[PDB]
Amino acid sequence: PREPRRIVIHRGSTGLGFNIVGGEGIFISFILAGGPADLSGELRKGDQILSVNGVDLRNASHEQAAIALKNAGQTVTIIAQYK
């Protein structure tokens, strides 16, 4: 697989612009066109979020991940495993 990749998402108006689903892992389920996660063209639906702002999310429940993303602030550093 492609090596895990570090991405910085800059939050803007009203959201980070992506949804998540998911030990089973946290996966991108939706990327909003024109939104903060669409701008760099890096993340895609199906990618696994391995970390947010230094916090390992490989074992996170959906709730734990959603908390971590909602509290990561305006600058969100993600390590993603491309599908």
Side-chain angles (χ1 to χ4, degrees):
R2 187 185 298 223
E3 290 297 327
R5 185 183 171 89
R6 189 158 177 151
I7 302 157
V8 182
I9 300 306
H10 300 272
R11 206 187 27 76
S13 295
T14 189
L16 293 165
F18 69 93
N19 295 345
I20 57 167
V21 291
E24 291 184 348
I26 302 288
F27 299 88
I28 303 190
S29 53
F30 176 70
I31 295 285
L32 181 65
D38 185 46
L39 301 193
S40 72
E42 291 168 293
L43 295 170
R44 300 186 194 195
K45 179 172 180 163
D47 291 346
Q48 190 179 347
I49 304 193
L50 307 181
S51 177
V52 173
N53 278 11
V55 180
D56 196 341
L57 291 181
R58 286 173 294 182
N59 289 330
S61 63
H62 193 271
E63 173 173 303
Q64 282 163 345
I67 292 167
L69 292 158
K70 288 290 205 306
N71 274 263
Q74 77 286 311
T75 307
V76 185
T77 309
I78 287 164
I79 306 307
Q81 175 64 64
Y82 282 15
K83 54 153 180 260

